[PDB]
């Protein structure tokens, strides 16, 4: 599958199976050296960000190519597959190892192999089922937010509620405002004061409980494996349902099936299929990462605790009150009943192959498959609900279609010209096609739950244009790959290929890529035998690779319609253009070494690598005088230097007692080398990062200095002057900070002990050098603006003349985005803890139906050592806003074998 | 294997072959203009004037502008494929207007010289579409000059900028990255674009939905006024001021029905096309409106100081239409000029608070003639047209003497982004920290001090350039010190 000289990490069944999250790349965080996965949303429906050996580019995606059994499929389609059907994941991290893939093999390739049936005699059926709950994994953010009358006090004394007002005068007003607002809705007018207290200065409303819940994860699975002769079958049906812990509704449930089949027909032909499909329902909390008054983790920190979204029995009301409001405000469950949403995905995955063997040595393999996704989605705005703007209802139905076919057939000749010269030649063809399409229609004006067909809407000023979007791409490629092996100690691999992408114009869509590599078996040639060294191999590779992950239509210089009236068509210029836009051309030098110690009970593999991206696809920002936002261009350059090492070994004391550990590490230094427009630096506006030629993608802010004890004013260091401070902030006080945005250290470790059926596994993961701006704290910590929102208990201490010994400033001045928000988002995470117990062997003899059973208790994400003050340190890149934190899971599970 | 893929709903850019291709592109220009010369876009400079205080409801949207939070106004705004808002937005929409008016003006001039048209009737209309494109360029460059070039009255500035205009680009060139043109360049491009267009456009306006000679006369008079050229503004004033009559209202309800009707306002010289299903937008920043069934409720984020309310006589029809005593149900006034045009309501019965983009109305021309006439010693026609404008509004003015001009203008142009410019030329400091708030609104509209004072000539009466344009173009000289 991959080269003897390429950097290759392979992950096992166990790291992939039985995971209470549908994003299996999370299950790899800290398992492959140099592979940096990070899931920035606990939203069930979110997908991780894998990056092998750094960020490959400043504009094209750096996501690895994903391959399942030969066919490139999106993380979205992998999510609908049953990962209990996965035999192994293999990560390919250098140009030698990724030489027969296209589209974007410059980012490494993740190859997922589904299980085939073991050529057994009885053939094994196996049954799994598990239940568990999701929670939030950090509570510390609200340990020090002001309490109810603590915040009332702060405001009144701050003059926010007017000058010369007492605390009771103010609460007289807020309770006044809830009484007259609620008094206008038949559904509330004589429930306020009986069952509803939206305003309550004697109890602090638990705003965490308002917007977050404990939620369940449920999954089950049966799978018949076996076969016997030249034929093999692996079939499975399965179920999965993960509900999202945000009370803002979000979920991922899938109903799964798969059938894998291979059969030798005769001494020349072997055919086989792997078939997979699923009915899937996903929904996502779409308000997260924005700042909306009473939602998300921002809500749970900023809502004044004298505001009660609950009723009198502790249950969640339909609606809460905020002073000034003209409408009562729907709570998260009642918003959901009033804004219903569903979506069915029918997912099809058909893949065949033929393996003709005409004469000794050559293997012709032809493979093809489709990857169809028809998705049907419905959305309403329920009529007659009195907390809406109108009593009239709306409904929006959309239908989606993704069909991606790909054929990829090969001819391979292996021969030998001696006992010491092994040769392998293989070349192949591959056509990749994608056809996508999105259609949607909507109506409004409904006045009945039961009369809400789209075709029954009002017609006049209530009619709408449909929604319509199409997108297709295509790839044509020819590749070759050779293998020379002398005396079984020296091995060389060479490769040439040409890729052609629909995403570039006719005169620039082709590009040639090559690779050379050698593995040298130092052990078996220069050291026949050693009393402690078991295996020693030296690998080394150079090669070039293509990267094409960009839009589908990003070169043409185009017009779109922009109608001015209703009787004539109008036309505006749509896109800037780049007739010369073409492949990004990446380059990899990789020097590796693998070593085996003792009696292959101790392995190591170190790899040094130099990743070069020339012709880099940058979506260059354009000055606004141009009247555009962007235009992709092959502009600029970048470097990724680093090392990754991984090692593992076994520690018995009793043989019937296994202790086994594993470690995983990468360091990676990044260097932008060439930008655009002769620029040496480009700071990316209102992002706090900067591209500057000398250094890597870095943060860029003013150094906050603290406060002037004389005035209470905030001070920032003035860069370059002597250290010089100032009370006058200006944008020209900003400077590049020696902290990187892509976190430079990726690693993990995992332990294991097994006594006799009882075993404990723990997997850890870390990401050090991470930094993030805590956009949340821009709100919770200032005393110059947003005086409605709950604040941090540190503002009760703010400098005034009589309290002149603090580092928290006087009230009335807003904070700038300086280093006071740059938090150290490094974290170690305990990715999963599993205690499992496989029932004894002698418990089953005598009942010839069951052959074994296993029970396990399990936790995901329980330990999070980190300095970050905002729930999840993983939930972000450069900034961290209203986050949906990753979840903490407790799961108990069962397995049956017949 | 043909692996060209071409995007659906897109066509390739080509030069104009037919007259029908030209007309279709002129519309896209006018569509663009409609989300550009848009009242949403001028609220930022409306709120930065001395007229407003923030309420407890605001979520720091209008505060940077009302309380002069210079740390926020520096980078203020956005301009990507998610949101076009704020200062960055105001900048970006006018540049696209200019760039796209570039490729229209230049491609019509090319087609004419390549004689592609099928008769002289097309040729004559396309030479006239050409003048329209010219006015749009002058507006685009002037609106960019209104906000990113300094007045002659400013004191401290970054070294070099006191004489700079905006980046003048007369060609459709997306890749262009040049330096700032001078003041006299930008204003000579604006005035000559307009002069070259006023020659060609016909005396009588053909459509209130497109550029006309009457419009360019007015827009030019607006520009002269803000240039201090008082005599020259009064001459373009007189060319159109008598062709558009004032709203004939007996009470404030006949006034509100007429003024709020895009279709029936006899004062509208040039507006953007609007239907309920195309070209209507909600502009509920000033007023805080939201529908409630058959009604309208308000939760504003900023409200006038008392002195604004006290500007209006009680019998002024604008005092229940331009501003409206509907804050806290009936306790204080808000700016309600952009409340709704009912004609854009999906259902007659139910408000959706949608309006259209108006571009010039004869009320402004009355106030440009009146101010200019006072400066050039022409009292007879200075008082004729100011008493005319205020008597139509139900509160005819006592004495006519410039002091009187400032109030009446402030009243009529409220909400339209006009007051901040008026205080620069009238040499008024901000004085926001000392204005009384509306008493009826105590506890909802409180006083908030300036985060930075704004005395006469403060550099921040002019916006800084967007940080996108500064970071991508080291040859751009900044407005603010240091």
């Amino acid at each position: 599958l991959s080269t003897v000289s390429g950097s290759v990490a392979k992950v096992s069944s166990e790291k992939l199976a039985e995971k209470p999250v549908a994003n299996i790349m999370d299950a790899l965080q800290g398992q492959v050296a140099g592979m940096q996965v990070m899931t920035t949303s606990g939203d069930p429906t979110a997908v991780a960000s894998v990056e092998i050996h750094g960020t490959g580019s400043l504009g094209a995606s750096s996501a690895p190519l994903y391959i399942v059994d030969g066919m490139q499929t999106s993380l979205d389609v992998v999510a609908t597959m049953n990962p209990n059907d996965f035999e192994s994941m293999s990560v390919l991290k250098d140009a030698s190892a990724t030489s027969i893939y296209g589209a974007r093999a410059a980012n490494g390739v993740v190859f997922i192999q589904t299980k085939k049936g073991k050529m057994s005699e009885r053939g094994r059926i196996t049954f799994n089922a598990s239940y568990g709950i999701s929670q939030i994994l950090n509570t510390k953010p609200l340990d020090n937010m002001m309490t109810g009358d603590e915040l009332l006090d702060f405001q009144v004394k701050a003059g926010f509620w007017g000058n010369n007002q007492t605390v009771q005068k103010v609460k007289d007003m807020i309770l006044a405002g809830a009484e007259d607002l609620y008094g206008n809705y038949d559904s509330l007018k004589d429930e306020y004061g009986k069952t509803l207290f939206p305003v309550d200065f004697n109890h602090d409303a638990d705003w965490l409980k308002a917007l977050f819940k404990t939620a369940p994860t449920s999954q089950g699975d049966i799978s018949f494996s076996g076969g016997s002769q030249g034929t093999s079958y692996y079939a499975s049906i399965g179920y999965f349902d993960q509900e999202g812990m945000a009370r803002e509704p979000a979920n991922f449930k899938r109903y799964s099936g798969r059938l894998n089949f291979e059969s030798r027909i005769n001494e020349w032909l072997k055919v086989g299929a792997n078939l997979s499909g699923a009915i899937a329902n996903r929904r996502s909390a779409d308000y997260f990462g924005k700042y909306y008054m009473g939602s998300g983790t921002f809500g749970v920190l900023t809502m004044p605790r004298y505001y009660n979204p609950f009723d009198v029995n502790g249950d969640l009301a339909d609606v809460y009150y905020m002073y000034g409001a003209t409408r009562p405000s729907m709570t998260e469950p009642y918003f959901a009943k009033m804004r219903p949403f569903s979506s069915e995905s029918h997912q099809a995955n058909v893949n065949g192959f033929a393996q003709i063997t005409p004469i000794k040595g050559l293997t012709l393999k032809a493979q093809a498959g489709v990857d169809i996704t028809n998705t049907r989605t419905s959305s309403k705005r329920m009529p007659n609900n009195p907390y809406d703007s109108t009593p009239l209802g709306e409904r929006r139905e959309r239908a989606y279609r993704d069909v991606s076919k790909s054929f990829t057939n090969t001819a391979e000749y292996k021969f030998s010209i001696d006992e010491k010269h092994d040769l392998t030649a293989l070349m192949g063809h591959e056509y990749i096609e994608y056809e996508g399409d999105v259609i949607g229609a909507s109506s409004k004006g409904f006045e009945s739950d039961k009369l809400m067909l789209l075709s029954q809407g009002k017609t006049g000023n209530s009619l709408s244009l449909p929604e319509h979007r199409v997108a297709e791409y295509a790839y044509l490629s020819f590749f070759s790959r050779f293998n020379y092996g002398f005396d079984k100690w020296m091995y060389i691999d060479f490769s040439v290929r040409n890729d052609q992408s629909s995403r570039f114009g006719s005169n620039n869509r082709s590009a040639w890529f090559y690779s050379v590599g050698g593995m040298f078996d130092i052990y078996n040639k220069f050291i026949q035998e050693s009393n402690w060294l078991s295996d020693l191999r030296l690998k080394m590779s150079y090669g070039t690779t293509g990267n094409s992950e960009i839009g589908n239509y990003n070169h043409q210089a185009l017009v779109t319609v922009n109608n001015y009236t209703e009787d004539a068509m109008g036309l505006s210029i749509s896109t800037a253009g780049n007739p010369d836009l073409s492949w990004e051309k990446q380059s990899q030098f990789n020097f590796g070494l693998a070593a085996g110690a003792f009696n292959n009970r101790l392995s190591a593999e170190v790899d040094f690598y130099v990743r070069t991206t020339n012709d880099m696809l940058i979506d260059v920002p354009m000055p606004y005088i141009s009247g555009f936002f962007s235009q992709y261009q092959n502009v600029g350059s970048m470097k990724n230097t680093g090392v990754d090492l991984s090692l593992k070994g076994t520690i018995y004391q009793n043989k019937d007692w296994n202790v086994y550990a594993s470690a995983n590490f990468n360091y990676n230094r990044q260097e932008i080398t060439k930008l655009f427009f002769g620029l040496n630096k480009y700071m990316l506006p209102n992002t706090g990062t900067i591209w500057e030629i000398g250094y890597p993608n870095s943060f860029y802010m003013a150094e906050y200095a603290g406060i002037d004890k004389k005035t209470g004013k905030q001070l920032w260091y003035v860069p370059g002057q002597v250290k010089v401070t100032t009370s006058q902030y200006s944008a020209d006080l900003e400077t590049r900070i020696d902290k990187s945005v892509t976190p430079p250290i990726t690693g993990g470790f995992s332990l294991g002990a097994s006594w006799k059926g009882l075993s404990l596994d723990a997997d850890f993961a870390y990401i050090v050098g991470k930094w993030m701006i805590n956009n949340d704290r821009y709100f919770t910590e200032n005393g110059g603006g947003l005086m409605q929102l709950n604040k941090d208990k540190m503002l009760l201490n703010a400098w005034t003349e009589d309290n002149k010994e603090t580092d928290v400033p006087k009230l009335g001045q807003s904070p700038q985005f300086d280093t006071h928000l740059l938090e150290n988002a490094s974290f170690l995470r305990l990715k999963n803890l599993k205690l499992t117990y496989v029932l004894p062997n002698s418990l089953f003899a005598g009942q010839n139906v069951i052959g074994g059973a296993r029970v396990y208790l399990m936790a995901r994400n329980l330990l999070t050592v980190t300095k970050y003050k905002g729930f999840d340190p993983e939930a972000g890149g450069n900034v961290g806003k209203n986050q949906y934190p990753n979840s903490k899971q407790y799961v108990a599970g069962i397995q049956l074998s017949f | 294997c043909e692996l060209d893929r071409d995007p659906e709903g897109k066509d390739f850019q080509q030069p104009y072959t037919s007259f029908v291709q030209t007309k279709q592109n002129r519309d896209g220009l006018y569509a663009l203009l409609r989300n550009t010369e848009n009242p949403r876009m001028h609220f930022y400079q409306e709120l930065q004037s001395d007229m407003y205080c923030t309420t407890i409801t605001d979520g720091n949207s209008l505060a940077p502008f009302v309380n002069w939070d210079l740390g926020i106004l520096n980078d203020h705004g956005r301009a990507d494929e998610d949101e076009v808002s704020g200062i960055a937005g105001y900048y970006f929409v006018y540049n696209r207007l200019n760039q796209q008016a570039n490729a229209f003006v230049n491609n019509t001039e090319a087609a004419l010289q390549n004689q592609v048209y099928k008769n002289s009737t097309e040729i004559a209309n396309a030479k006239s579409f050409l003048a329209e494109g010219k006015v749009l360029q002058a507006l685009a460059i002037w609106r960019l000059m209104d906000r990113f070039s300094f007045h002659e009255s400013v004191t401290e500035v970054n070294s070099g900028a006191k004489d700079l205009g905006v980046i003048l680009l007369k060609e459709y060139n997306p890749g262009y990255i040049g330096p700032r043109a001078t003041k006299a360049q930008c204003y000579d491009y604006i005035l000559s674009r307009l002069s070259e267009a006023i020659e060609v456009l016909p005396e009588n306006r053909e459509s209130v939905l497109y550029v006309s000679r009457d419009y360019a006369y007015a827009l030019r008079a607006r520009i002269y006024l803000a240039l201090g050229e008082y005599g020259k503004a009064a001459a373009d004033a007189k060319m159109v001021v008598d062709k558009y009559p004032l709203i004939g209202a007996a009470d404030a309800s006949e006034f509100e029905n007429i003024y709020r009707s895009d279709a029936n306002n006899p004062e509208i010289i040039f507006r953007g096309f609007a239907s309920a299903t195309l070209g209507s937008f909600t502009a509920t920043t000033l007023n805080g409106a939201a529908p409630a069934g058959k009604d309208i409720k308000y939760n504003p984020s900023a409200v006038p100081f008392q002195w604004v309310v006290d500007l209006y006589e009680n019998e002024d029809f604008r005092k229940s239409v331009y501003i409206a005593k509907v804050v806290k149900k009936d306790k204080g006034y808000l700016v309600n000029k952009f409340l709704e045009d009912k004609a854009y309501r999906d259902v007659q019965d139910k408000p959706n608070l949608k309006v259209g983009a108006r571009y010039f109305s004869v009320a402004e021309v009355y106030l440009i003639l009146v101010e200019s006439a006072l400066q050039t010693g022409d009292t007879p026609t200075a008082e004729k047209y100011l008493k005319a404008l205020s008597k139509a509004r139900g509160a005819e003015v006592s004495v006519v003497n410039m002091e009187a001009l400032q109030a009446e203008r402030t009243r009529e142009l409220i909400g339209e982004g006009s007051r901040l410019r008026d205080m620069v030329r009238w040499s008024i400091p901000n004085n926001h920290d000392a204005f009384e708030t509306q008493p009826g609104l105590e506890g909802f509209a409180n006083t908030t001090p300036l985060k930075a004072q704004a005395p006469v000539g403060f550099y921040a009466y002019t916006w800084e350039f967007p940080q996108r344009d500064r970071q991508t173009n080291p040859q751009l000289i900044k407005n603010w010190p240091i």
């Binding site: 008054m293 992002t687 806003k881 | 720091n60």
Partner: peptide, 10 residues
């Protein structure tokens, strides 16, 4: 009801 305050974008 959103609080723009400041949205340092990602």
């Amino acid at each position: 009801a959103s609080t723009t305050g400041a949205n340092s974008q990602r």
